[PDB]
Amino acid sequence: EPTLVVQALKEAVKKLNPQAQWRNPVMFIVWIGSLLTTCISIAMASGAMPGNALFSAAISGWLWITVLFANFAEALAEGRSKAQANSLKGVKKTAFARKLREPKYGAAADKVPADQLRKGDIVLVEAGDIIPCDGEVIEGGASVDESAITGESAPVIRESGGDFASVTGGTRILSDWLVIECSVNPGETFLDRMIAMVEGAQRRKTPNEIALTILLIALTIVFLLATATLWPFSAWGGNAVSVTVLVALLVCLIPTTIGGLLSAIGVAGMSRMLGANVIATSGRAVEAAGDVDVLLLDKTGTITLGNRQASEFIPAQGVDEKTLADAAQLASLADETPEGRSIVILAKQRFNLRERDVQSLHATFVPFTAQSRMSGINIDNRMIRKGSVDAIRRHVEANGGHFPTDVDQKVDQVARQGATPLVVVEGSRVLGVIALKDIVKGGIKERFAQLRKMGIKTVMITGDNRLTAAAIAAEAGVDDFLAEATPEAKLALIRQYQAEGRLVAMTGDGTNDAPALAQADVAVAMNSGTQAAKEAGNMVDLDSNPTKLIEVVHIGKQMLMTRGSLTTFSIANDVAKYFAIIPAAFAATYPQLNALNIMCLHSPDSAILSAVIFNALIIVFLIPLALKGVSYKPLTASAMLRRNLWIYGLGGLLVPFIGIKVIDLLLTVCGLV
Amino acid sequence: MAAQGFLLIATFLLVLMVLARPLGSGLARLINDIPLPGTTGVERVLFRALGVSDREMNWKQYLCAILGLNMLGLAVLFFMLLGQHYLPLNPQQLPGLSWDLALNTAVSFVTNTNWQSYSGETTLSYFSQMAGLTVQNFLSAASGIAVIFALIRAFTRQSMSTLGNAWVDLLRITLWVLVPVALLIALFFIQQGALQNFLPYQAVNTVEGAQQLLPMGPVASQEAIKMLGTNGGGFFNANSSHPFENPTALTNFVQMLAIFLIPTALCFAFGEVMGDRRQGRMLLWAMSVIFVICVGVVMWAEVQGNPHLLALGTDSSINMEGKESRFGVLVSSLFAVVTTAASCGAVIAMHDSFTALGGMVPMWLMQIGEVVFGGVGSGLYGMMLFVLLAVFIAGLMIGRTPEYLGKKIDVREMKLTALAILVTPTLVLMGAALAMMTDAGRSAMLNPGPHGFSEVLYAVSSAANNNGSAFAGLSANSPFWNCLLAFCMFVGRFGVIIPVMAIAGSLVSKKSQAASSGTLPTHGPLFVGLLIGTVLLVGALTFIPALALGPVAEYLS
Amino acid sequence: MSGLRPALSTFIFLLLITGGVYPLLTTVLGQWWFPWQANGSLIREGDTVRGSALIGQNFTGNGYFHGRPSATAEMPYNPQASGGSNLAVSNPELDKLIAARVAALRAANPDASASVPVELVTASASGLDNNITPQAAAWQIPRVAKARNLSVEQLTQLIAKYSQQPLVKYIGQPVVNIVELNLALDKLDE
Amino acid sequence: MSAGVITGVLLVFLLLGYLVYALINAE
Ligand SMILES: CCCCCCCCCCCCCCCCCC(=O)OC[C@H](COP(=O)([O-])OCC(O)COP(=O)([O-])OC[C@@H](COC(=O)CCCCCCCCCCCCCCCCC)OC(=O)CCCCCCCCCCCCCCCCC)OC(=O)CCCCCCCCCCCCCCCCC
Ligand SMILES: CCCCCCCCCCCCCCCCCC(=O)OC[C@H](COP(=O)([O-])OCC(O)COP(=O)([O-])OC[C@@H](COC(=O)CCCCCCCCCCCCCCCCC)OC(=O)CCCCCCCCCCCCCCCCC)OC(=O)CCCCCCCCCCCCCCCCC
Ligand SMILES: [K+]
Ligand SMILES: [K+]
Ligand SMILES: [K+]
Ligand SMILES: [K+]
Ligand SMILES: [K+]
Ligand SMILES: [K+]
Ligand SMILES: [K+]
Ligand SMILES: [K+]
Ligand SMILES: [K+]
């Protein structure tokens, strides 16, 4: 909780407008009770009604603090989202654009800010200037630092080739001029869509949150009825219970923990989804991704799914580590595969490899091909192709070069280590081998076994033959594998998996597998221009990782079970709330009821203040759990229910006793009451 | 003492399950629209004569049918009670009832509550007892069993837009499950000492020379339908304490078996018709655990009675006040728990004379919603609402969409379940509040201290939760009391029936999935304990302050 | 229109079938199989009735057996108002009534034990209670024997004759029919 | 009754009506 964010969010909180409060019925009831207790306190201070006129004031102040804490939760979640929003948008608020009239560079560069310019224009960007437009490229070439999307700062080639000519967002260029024709208008710009997403928080509630609010409202109704009927019941026996005690019991009984933390949970979970390089338009799709029973992972362009990434560089006899990393960075520069992205990221992390001056090289770049499983460039007359070891062995044996030496025991060593060997070549001489290690610390096999223990099934689709698909399936640990994939075959697979009443979540290409993505219940689209994807739906994956649907399952089950755990906690606290307030509330109506005070508290007003203070402070103490979700252990459904009960139901039955006791002890030592 | 009570609980439970499992199979056959053996051939002729073609109807038509028949019963009973002196079978030539008592009795006997604000033997005639009370005891029970039949059918049927036939359901229930079993029970009651005559009130020359006017009548048949249909509307002032009503301990045992017979058989029928008996055994395990704990607590509280009896020179402190002598204190306690758990107004013992702790647990156990072996079908769909809450909470815990037995639970089901669970506690709370803010409600009082508020709260809970068991010290013959309790009975039964019917009509439109490893099972000790915790925790969160101002304050006093 | 036909048809059929046939069949079966059980179990002695074998009578006589208290309207043992004492446990009115009954029974039975049985001082649920425990009957033996000039052994034999234990011990309690016992006592003495 | 009692009862009824309306709605 950094101060420069928390203070500004508290400043946003301080507007306690009733219009912003009545959308949440639980804390609108709490707000109404707070205003009622405040008015009672002012009337008692003026002289309208007798009594303490300070106990009521303290109760009203702490109820106002409860309302402010719920608003602190909601605005803290909104500010945590808006920090990541302004980490990308804030550069483009104060910038400039270089306009042009013709695609030729040899023209007068017109100076227009172009912050509201329509589509179909022509602009220019050069020498580290921020790209202000989102369109296509007809000519030019430069290295582009996609920090605003990737978050790892890695150069990509943006040249007119057919697929590598699509800029996105306010993204930093690094080499030289690159003419751009923006094909969108503001509002459908990527940064504008992220603005609409971060300002689109809790505009439409998900069905899970709607049903949870229905249950919370029903609990609010029964608690309100009991509290309101206590005055006629206790007015007959002795003097009536004071109204401020009734309002304190009402607020302290109503579930205000989950009631104030629900929107915080939703916004923080969607912020966590945004931090996982996933563009989700609505949270209903995220909840469905948490709700599915089978997972389909389309491997057609990537290599060994997406868990395997670059770990370390193994050189050769006739090359140096710096030269090997230079060749690998130049080869994988023109690769949007997660493997090539990992190669670029590892090279940057090792030797700080940067801008390469692609236009001075004058090399035409060939991207990754699904059938060839190859990716390389055309510098001068040599090929810097790289890929799988069998494919590159076929490539080097297709020419007159001699077969490489010691690479067999090198790839044997990395296979004994347990990594996929990625090999680069200069055209005739093998320049080394790269070990692709799994990025999951616990292991992708253990993660898939945990998914199996969760009851959710994992299936991957491979475009290669039966042997490669079986090998990758045995290496990963999946349940079913497919070979020779066609869109008709995958649509039929989705239909026959849905035929047994199961929900299908499938990730794949948004441009090649769009009907099957629409057929699937959840669609984590990847490798797209993202414009029509976000228009149609089709939850956009940024770094095109096929295994991030597991990450959505994590962030899309964690939110739901955090909601359930906090709901059960807020329900279960009320037993200790009874044991604290009921003897305090009925101290004068029935003095025999002091035997129910099982905890040795001092005075009834001290008990009421202690219970109200704990009810206020539990929201602050559960801020980190609501922001981070729950660190949950993937097991069977019965085991998860048992663990969640043993943690949160027993917490709700135990820790309010301890908290009320220690708050009353602190009050008695400090002498306020 | 403790061994005798445990033996009584165990014997009653095992005999109940043994006698109720074949009735569970019979109710399963009625649910699956399969005619009973020996009934077809004349059932078709009866439906052809009655103009029912067994046409399937949806939830709107089905609920409208049941509600219209209930209004017809209410109107017929109200006119019969107003004009009972014109009707025959008047041994004492009793006058017609007042408007408030007639309306309260009509609403009470149509809403399967059977609250009595009067003395039967000096209020109602033989024709009134024979027709307007027994017919309503059949019809309200048949309506409840029909509602739970349609709910079980909604849980079975996959993507259909209809539920069943209301007239076929009520006719089958009344003619096959109700009339023969109540006939056997009434024949056993006449085997014991119970009235099934129509003689006038026989004057008795007492041995010491006093005068006794014995109230003869057709008592045994009304007893049998009262016990079988979980009704509780007695012939006399004492709903089951009268020796013309319960002459023997065997008769009392048959009474408790007949009370718990149809909820147990309906749980067994649910378990059989779902295909998996584990859900019915889950419901039975939860209700049996709560019931055993409640009987143990009430038996201990009645054994550890008042110390005033020991102080004023008696050989034992057992609270025998307000209890019959032919049945023990343990039997009276067990019947009190049975009748306050299963929505039955019949009482062996006067519940005012119970200890505060032994009268709290009947009160709380009927305030939770009357769901532990409750009503006749009524407690089973009360369990359905509570297990909908339980499966929603458990689905939230496991991170998946809630799903009870294949069908997912959505916003509309959540709204209707929340409303149905809201309906009866709000009636209890505002009815008791309105009774405590009016001198008309505070003038009918009998006992002082917190026991008086206990009496008021118990009466309002009896009206709203369709029990009819009364703290008999409260004088509910006031017009304000009659109107308030009648409103509570009406809104309670019909505003629980309507939203659970909308729940059934929402559930028929859904298709059940396949039970995967990721789906939470709805059986086992974990889910039984979760459902028990849900029911007791909701009942506590609704009624701990009221019980603290009433029976808890009395017990600590 | 469409719904007024089957609703009315089903209602009239079920009303007639239940309300007519079920009590009529139950009544004819009762009067055919168990007479003097469906008719009230009235003890008939020479063209008059002396009470049922189930209801119970007010016995304030010194030579009779005193049953449980009744507390019914307009009369102690009033079958026209078969209610019960609904006084609470914490009721001082019930406390003073119990104390008065204890004092009255201690005055009436001096030769018996000082601690009276619970049944003889606590009112029943229905005031028409014909039953007391055999321990209460044994408590009442000495006063009846002294009043009627009889023996404790004969009174014990008569009580055990009119003691009706249930079929199973733990579904009820053994009880003594007070009205039949007093009638047999008067028939044996005179 | 009294002014405070009747305004408390009416405020409870308006809060109950607002909560029932919120339960009926999905926002
Ligand atoms: C204090 C004791 C607490 C326990 C009491 C006993 C509870 C049952 C014991 C179960 C444990 C042993 C069984 C092993 C498997 C366990 C897993 C399981 O799911 O068991 C299900 C178990 C059997 O199911 P299953 O074997 O898995 O299914 C096999 C068939 O495919 C399914 O079809 P089916 O089962 O209908 O067909 C078989 C059936 C054919 O059905 C019939 O024709 C009629 C029989 C059905 C009713 C059986 C009697 C049920 C009586 C229950 C109440 C007993 C008194 C308890 C009073 C407690 C008072 C404190 O014939 C049988 O074989 C019956 C099972 C025999 C086991 C019970 C032995 C009977 C003696 C009576 C109980 C004595 C104690 C047992 C030992 C416990 C340890 C002390 O349930 C039953 O016994 C009968 C099913 C219907 C009744 C279930 C409702 C239970 C109500 C609980 C009341 C207890 C009070 C609550 C405790 C309160 C504490 C605070
Ligand atoms: C505060 C939260 C506390 C959470 C407690 C969680 C306890 C976990 C213990 C950890 C050890 C487990 C490790 C082994 C797991 C597998 C073992 C197994 O077979 O199943 C045992 C079971 C696994 O669950 P499952 O998936 O359903 O079983 C699969 C079987 O195939 C299907 O079961 P089955 O029928 O086939 O089993 C056959 C046999 C197998 O026997 C075994 O092998 C058992 C092995 C473990 C020994 C421990 C005994 C467990 C069963 C006894 C439970 C009664 C005592 C409960 C003690 C709780 C603390 C342990 O069991 C029997 O002999 C009779 C079973 C007949 C079923 C009827 C059960 C009697 C009703 C009792 C209900 C619960 C007590 C009332 C609670 C009332 C509180 C309000 O784990 C349990 O221990 C269940 C106990 C849960 C107690 C309920 C906690 C209630 C707390 C308040 C409610 C909170 C509501 C809050 C809601 C707020 C919003 C509204
Ligand atoms: K609720
Ligand atoms: K709370
Ligand atoms: K009832
Ligand atoms: K009654
Ligand atoms: K309820
Ligand atoms: K109910
Ligand atoms: K009910
Ligand atoms: K009900
Ligand atoms: K409730």
In terms of CA atoms, which chain D residue is nearest residue A235? D5
Contact list in B for residue C183 (CB cut-off 8 A) is 207
Residue pair C133/C144 in contact (Cβ under 8 Å)? The answer is: no
Q: How far is CA A153 from CA A148, A342, A633, C93, in A?
A: 8, 12, 33, 89
Look at chain B and report how many structural domains it folds into.
1
Task: Give dist(CA B361, CA B339) in Å, integer.
Answer: 12
Beta-bridge partners for C131: C177
Convert B268-298 to b/e letters by CB count within 10 Å (16 or more is b).
Answer: bbbbbbbebbbbbbbbbbbbbbbbebbbbbb
Residue B72 host element (H or E) = helix B59-82
- C-alpha angle A469-A473-A478 in degrees, rounded to nearest 5: 135
Helix, coil or strand: residue A159: strand
Helix (H) or strand (E) holding A437: strand A430-438
Q: Which residues, at least 6 apart from A494, have a Cβ–Cβ distance to it below 8 Å? A: A296, A504, A506, A516, A519, A520
CA distance readout (Å), B356 to A233, A581, B300, B544: 17, 22, 12, 14
CA distance B500 to B418: 10
Cα B477 to Cα B117, B233, B482, distances in angstroms: 5, 16, 6
**Using CB atoms within 10 A of its CB, is residue A387 exposed (0-12), middle (13-18) or buried (19+)?**
buried
CB atoms within 10 A of CB A138: 12
Distance CA B339, CA B258 (A): 11
User: Chain B: residue nearest C185 by CA?
Assistant: B207
Q: How far apart are CA C50 and CA B203, in angstroms?
A: 9
Cβ-Cβ contacts under 8 Å, A205 against chain D = 26-27
Contact indicator for A612, A246 with CB cutoff of 8 Å: no
Pick from B432, B445, B447, B450: nearest CA to B555: B450
C87 and C156 both lie in a single domain: yes
User: Taking CA C117 as the corner, what is the angle to CA C115 and CA C123, rounded to the nearest 5 degrees?
Assistant: 130
Does residue C52 sit at the B interface (CB-CB below 8 Å)? yes
CA of D14, closest CA in chain A: separation in Å?
11
Place of tokens 């009947």: B362
Cα–Cα distance, C117 to C132 (Å, whole number): 10
Q: Is A485 within 8 Å of A472 (Cβ atoms)?
A: no
Top-tier CATH class for A87-198 = mainly beta
Residue C34 and residue C53 in one domain = no
CA B498, chain centre distance (Å): 18
For residue B130, the enclosing domain spans: 22-202+212-274
For C156, phi then psi, to 5°, come to: -65, -40
Summary count for chain D: helices (H), strands (E): 1, 0
Residue type, A342: S
Q: Which residues contact B486 (CB under 8 A, 6 or more apart)?
A: B103, B104, B107, B108, B463
Tell me whether strands A294-299 and A504-509 are parallel, antiparallel or unpaired: parallel
Residue type, position B163, single letter: L
- Those residues whose C-beta lies under 8 Å from the C-beta of residue B229, and which sit 6 or more positions away, are B112, B137, B138, B140, B141, B178, B182, B262, B376
- Could you tell me the two tokens for C3? 């719904």
Backbone angles phi, psi at C99, to 5 degrees: -65, -40
Q: Is A465 exposed, middle or buried (0-12, 13-18, 19+ CB in 10 A)?
A: exposed
Q: How far apart are CA A149 and CA A60, in angstroms?
A: 47
Rounded to 5°, the CA angle C46-C52-C57 comes to 105
Q: In what order do the strands lie in the sheet with C175-177?
A: C131-132, C175-177, C163-164
**Rounded to 5°, angle at Cα A207 from A205 and A209:** 60
Under DSSP, the state recorded for A192 is: H
Quote the number of domains for chain C: 2
Query: Do the annotations mark residue A372 as ligand-binding?
Result: yes
Task: Give D-chain residues touching B427 at CB under 8 angstroms.
Answer: none
Give me A366's structure tokens: 């060939």
Joined tokens for residue C18: 């239940």
Helix (H, G, I), strand (E, B) or coil at A171: coil
Q: Which of A63, A75, A73 is nearest to A30 (CA)?
A: A63
Structural domain includes residue B377: no
Alpha helices of A398-547 — where are they, by DSSP H? 407-417, 444-453, 466-476, 487-498, 514-519, 531-536
Which ligand 1 atom lies nearest to the CA of residue B16? 51
Q: How far apart are CA A55 and CA A46, in angstroms?
A: 15
Cβ-defined contacts of B47-55 (< 8 Å, 24+): B47/B167, B47/B168, B47/B171, B50/B167, B50/B171, B50/C6, B50/C9, B50/C10, B50/C13, B51/C5, B51/C6, B51/C9, B52/B165, B52/B167, B52/B168, B52/B171, B52/C6, B52/C9, B52/C10, B54/B165, B54/B168, B55/B165
- Residue C21 neighbours by CB under 8 Å, 6+ apart: none
Give the span between the Cα atoms of B84 and B80, in whole angstroms: 6
Distance CA A529, CA A33 (A): 52
- Phi and psi dihedrals of B465, rounded to 5? -100, 15
> Within 10 A of A145 (CB to CB), how many other CB atoms are there?
17
Kindly provide the residue ranges of all beta strands, DSSP E only, lying in A195-293, ordered along the sequence. 278-279
**Same domain assignment for residues C140 and C113:** yes
Provide long-range contacts, Cβ within 8 A and 24+ apart, for A167-170: A167/A131, A167/A133, A167/A134, A167/A135, A167/A136, A167/A137, A168/A134, A168/A529, A168/A530, A169/A88, A169/A131, A169/A134, A170/A88, A170/A89, A170/A91, A170/A92, A170/A95, A170/A130, A170/A131, A170/A132
Q: Burial, A400: exposed, middle or buried (Cβ in 10 Å; 0-12, 13-18, 19+)?
A: exposed
Active-site residue identified among A121, A134, A176, A298: A298
DSSP B552: I
Distance, in Å, from the CA atom of A152 to the CA atom of A144, rounded to the nearest integer, reads 13
A582 in reach of chain B (CB within 8 A): yes
One domain, residues C91 and C49: yes
B511 shares contact with chain A (CB less than 8 Å)? yes
Q: A83 CB contacts (<8 Å, ≥6 apart)?
A: A5
CA–CA separation, A359 and A174 (whole Å) = 12
Please answer whether residues B237 and C81 qualify as being in contact, where contact means their C-beta atoms are separated by less than 8 angstroms: yes
Chain B partners of C115 at a C-beta cutoff of 8 Å?
A: 313-315
Distance of CA A200 to the CA centre of its chain: 15
Q: Within 10 A of A38 (CB to CB), how many other CB atoms are there?
A: 17
How far apart are alpha carbons B26 and A203 in whole angstroms?
A: 52
d(C-alpha A407, C-alpha A389), whole Å = 10
Q: How far apart are CA A527 and CA A510, in angstroms?
A: 7
Return the residue in A205, A212, A221, A284 with the most chain D beta carbons within 10 A, the one to mutate for interface testing: A221
Which subunits count as partners of chain B given 3+ CB pairs below 8 Å?
A, C, D
- What is the residue whose two structure tokens read 């035997």? A595
Q: Nearest Cα to B342, choosing from B385, B366, B378, B375?
A: B375
Structural domain harbouring D13: 1-27
Q: Are A601 and A50 in contact (CB under 8 A)?
A: no
Residue type, position C83, single letter: G
Query: Which residue type sits at B546?
Result: A
Q: How far apart are CA C129 and CA C51, in angstroms?
A: 12
Same domain, C23 and C109: no
Q: CA B234 to CA B347: how far, in whole Å?
A: 9
Tokens of B339: 């009748």
CA distances for A136 relative to A168, A179, A584, C55, C107, angstroms: 9, 9, 72, 102, 115
Main-chain dihedrals φ then ψ at residue A630, nearest 5 degrees = -110, 135
- Environment class of residue A671 by beta-carbon count within 10 Å: exposed (0-12), middle (13-18) or buried (19+)? exposed
Taking 3-state DSSP, the helix, strand and coil percentages for chain C, each rounded to the nearest 5, stand at 45, 10, 45
Residues C83 and C13 in one domain: no
Going from the C-alpha of A288 to that of each of A292, A523, A636, C48, the distances in angstroms are 6, 10, 19, 83
**Residue closest to A186 by CA, chosen among A279, A89, A275:** A89
Q: Cα–Cα distances in Å, from A271 out to A90, A127, A194, A526?
A: 17, 33, 11, 20
Here the tokens at position B167 are 């007239």
Q: Is C125 helix (H, G, I), strand (E, B) or coil?
A: coil
Q: How far apart are CA A329 and CA A347, in angstroms?
A: 7
Q: Distance between CA atoms of B553 and C9, rounded to whole angstroms?
A: 54
Cβ–Cβ < 8 Å for A306, A340: no
User: Which residue do the tokens 């209410």 mark?
Assistant: B74
User: Hey, is B88 helix, strand or coil?
Assistant: coil
Tell whether B450 lies on the interface with A, counting CB pairs under 8 A: yes
**DSSP letters for B162-191:** --B-HHHHHHHIIIIIIHHHHHHHHHHHHH
What is the number of residues in chain A?
673
Assign A481 to helix, strand or coil: strand
Chains D and A are touching, with contact defined as 3 or more CB–CB pairs separated by less than 8 Å: yes
Indicate the SS3 state at residue C188.
helix
Beta-bridged to residue C116, according to DSSP, are: B314
- CA-based nearest residue to B234, from C124, B242, B197: B242
- What are A469's two structure tokens? 């698909």
* Same domain for C6 and C31: yes
Give me the residues paired with residue A312 across strands: A435
Q: What is the largest CA-CA distance in chain B?
A: 79
Please state, in angstroms and rounded to a whole number, the distance separating the CA atoms of residues A326 and A353.
8
Ligand 5 center from residue B231 Cα (angstroms): 4
Residues C85 and C167 in one domain: yes
Contact A233 B436 (CB under 8 A): yes
Strand-strand pairing, A457-462 and A294-299: parallel
CA separation for the pair C4, B167 (Å, rounded): 12
Q: Are A30 and A66 in contact (CB under 8 A)?
A: yes
Question: Which residues, including other chains, have CB under 8 Å from residue A382's CB and lie 6 or more apart?
Answer: A426, A427
What Rg, from alpha-carbon coordinates, does chain A have?
31
CA-CA distance, B283 to C68, in Å (whole number)? Answer: 42
CATH of A321-437, one of 1.10.10.10, 3.40.1110.10, 3.90.180.10, 3.40.30.10: 3.40.1110.10
* C126 neighbors C67 (Cβ within 8 angstroms): no
Torsion of CA B54, B59, B60, B61, to 10 degrees: 10
> Is B512:A501 a contact under the CB 8 Å cutoff?
yes
Helix (H, G, I), strand (E, B) or coil at A321: helix
Which residue's CA is minimally distant from atom 34 of ligand 1?
A: B277
Distance from C-alpha of A224 to C-alpha of A364, rounded to nearest angstrom = 73
Q: Are B430 and A229 in contact (CB under 8 A)?
A: yes
Sequence-separated (6 or more) residues with CB below 8 Å from residue A200? none
Q: What ranges in B312-377 are assigned the alpha helix state H?
A: 329-341, 356-367
Q: Domain range holding C20?
A: 1-39
Cα separation, A387 vs A382, in Å, equals 16
Q: How many structural domains is chain D composed of?
A: 1
**Ligand 1 site: residues with CB under 6 angstroms?**
B 6, 9-10, 13-14, 17-18, 21, 277, 281, 284-285, 288-289, 292-293
Is B64 a domain residue?
Answer: yes
The Cα angle at residue A510 between residues A508 and A513, in degrees rounded to 5: 65
Is residue A528 annotated as involved in ligand binding? no
Instruction: Quickly list H helices, A292-357.
Output: 321-332, 338-351
HSE-CB for B240 with a 13 A CA cutoff: 36
For residues C134 and C95, membership in a common domain is answered with yes
| DSSP helix, strand, coil percent of chain D (3-state; round to 5) | 80, 0, 20
Measured in degrees and rounded to the nearest 5, phi and psi for residue A287 equal -65, -35
The shortest C-alpha distance from B314 to chain C (Å) reads 5
The single-letter DSSP state of residue B207 is T
Which chains touch D (3+ CB pairs under 8 A)? A, B
The alpha carbon dihedral of C123, C127, C129, C130 has a sign of: positive
Query: How many angstroms is it from C37 CA to the middle of ligand 3?
Result: 51
Q: What is the DSSP letter of B313?
A: T
Exposed/middle/buried for residue A371 (C-beta within 10 Å: 0-12, 13-18, 19+): exposed
Structure tokens at C178: 């007070």
Residues of chain B with Cβ-Cβ distance to C88 below 8 Å are: 352-353, 447, 449, 451, 473, 554
Chain D residue closest in CA terms to A23: D27
Pairing of strands A457-462, A430-438: unpaired
User: How far is residue A665's CA from residue B237's CA, in Å, rounded to a whole number?
Assistant: 56
A110 belongs to the catalytic site? no
**Single-letter amino acid, residue B412:** R
Q: Is A220 on the interface with D (CB under 8 A)?
A: yes
